Design a protein around this ligand. Structure first.
Ligand SMILES: [Zn+2]
Ligand SMILES: [Zn+2]
Length: 56
């Protein structure tokens, strides 16, 4: 009467613009983007990982 198995799973993300199978990512913030189009509206306010402690 005891168990402890963690269903090994992976993380899947989708374009943060249209939410579709991202073919490429931003060479800055590394965001999911299908085509340049979706990347356009992004680049505008593309905010990469700011220097210093942010996430961890
Ligand atoms: Zn997209
Ligand atoms: Zn970016």
């Amino acid at each position: 009467g005891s168990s402890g198995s963690s269903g090994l799973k992976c993380s899947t993300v989708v374009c943060v613009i249209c939410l579709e199978k991202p073919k490429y990512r931003c060479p800055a913030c590394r965001v999911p983007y299908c085509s340049v189009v979706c990347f356009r509206k992004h680049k505008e306010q593309c905010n990469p990982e700011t220097s210093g402690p942010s996430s961890g």
